[PDB]
């Protein structure tokens, strides 16, 4: 119950951050919330990182980790993702 409401807030926070910021100069991937992580505006041909989402029940023990995603050279996001640093450490 509280997990999902915190997850809702994380998604709301992502929309707000995009609506109160602009992308960097040049070709850049559009910001997007993919139901797991909030992806910010990212320069083309780079691998983006954002902190492990603070809605995870185990966020405290992964708070210094990141999830990664590729921003293609065409300003388009990739479909692959590395969220190993955000896994539940049992």
């Amino acid at each position, epitope marked *: 119950g509280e997990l999902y409401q915190r997850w809702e807030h994380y998604g709301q926070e992502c929309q707000k951050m995009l609506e*109160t910021t602009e992308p960097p100069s040049g070709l850049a991937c559009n910001g997007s919330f993919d139901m797991y992580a909030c992806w910010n505006y990212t320069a083309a041909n780079t691998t983006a990182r954002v902190s492990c989402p603070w809605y995870l029940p185990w966020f405290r023990q992964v708070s210094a980790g990141f999830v990664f995603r590729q921003c293609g050279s065409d300003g388009q996001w990739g479909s692959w993702r590395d969220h190993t640093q955000c896994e539940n450490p049992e």
Partner: antibody, heavy 118, light 114 residues
């Protein structure tokens, strides 16, 4: 620098209509959500309406919902506020505002004064 | 709707002294998820539009000097101005930035003893 220049204020008869405009420059207008905030003379600040960058989500204050319509023209870098069924209590200086994470409201325009009177 | 209550309604101080004003919300502005308080302060000079001072309770906007300090959490918040200057004459508003509708306090008017 960011600057918002409001326009369209003046005298409106009680129950009439009036459309305010807000010309923005110094930032990527199409990337920001925009607000209208008003201030009755000698009184405080009251948030009125918000429109997201793509006009996909919109919030209105209760005292305004049903009468005012917020809209924008991104290519022309312009925010609009269409007011209808105005009354004496709508008399205020009307500000348009842009956000700056982490806040919804950061930069304010000079404002335009709307007087509702017979 | 969250009601924002500011006190004092106004006060007067001489240049060089330090002032403190309070801002209270009828509901908590603390997001326990990210541990941030959604409280923002504005400074409105006479005859000017409001100016962003502090966001997320304590984060000064770029250009705002150190003598403006925001603090508090939950429902109790405070703005503190040290080495008050003549130009600090303004009405100081706090605003609920947590949820819509966004609501402002009635303001604290800072006047100067001369």
């Amino acid at each position: 620098d960011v600057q918002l220049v409001e326009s369209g204020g003046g005298l409106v008869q009680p129950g009439g209509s009036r459309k305010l405009s807000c010309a923005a420059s110094g930032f990527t207008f199409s990337s920001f959500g925009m607000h209208w905030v008003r201030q009755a003379p000698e009184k405080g600040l009251e948030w009125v309406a918000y429109i997201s960058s793509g006009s996909s989500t919109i919030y209105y204050a209760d005292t305004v919902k049903g009468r005012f319509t917020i809209s924008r023209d991104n290519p022309k870098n312009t925010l609009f506020l269409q007011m209808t069924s105005l009354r004496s209590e709508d008399t205020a200086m009307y500000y348009c505002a842009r956000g700056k994470y982490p806040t919804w409201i950061a930069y304010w325009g000079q404002g335009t004064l709307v007087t509702v009177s017979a | 709707d969250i009601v924002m209550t500011q006190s004092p309604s106004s006060l007067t101080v001489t240049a060089g002294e330090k002032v403190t004003m309070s801002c209270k919300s009828s509901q908590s502005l603390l997001n326990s998820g990210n541990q941030k308080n959604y409280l923002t302060w504005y400074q409105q000079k006479p005859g000017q539009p409001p100016k962003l001072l502090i966001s997320w309770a304590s984060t000064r906007d770029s250009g705002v000097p150190d003598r403006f300090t925001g603090s508090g959490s939950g429902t109790d918040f405070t703005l503190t101005i040290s080495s008050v200057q003549a130009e600090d004459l303004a009405v100081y508003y706090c605003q609920n930035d947590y949820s819509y509708p966004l609501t402002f306090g009635a303001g604290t008017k800072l006047e100067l003893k001369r």
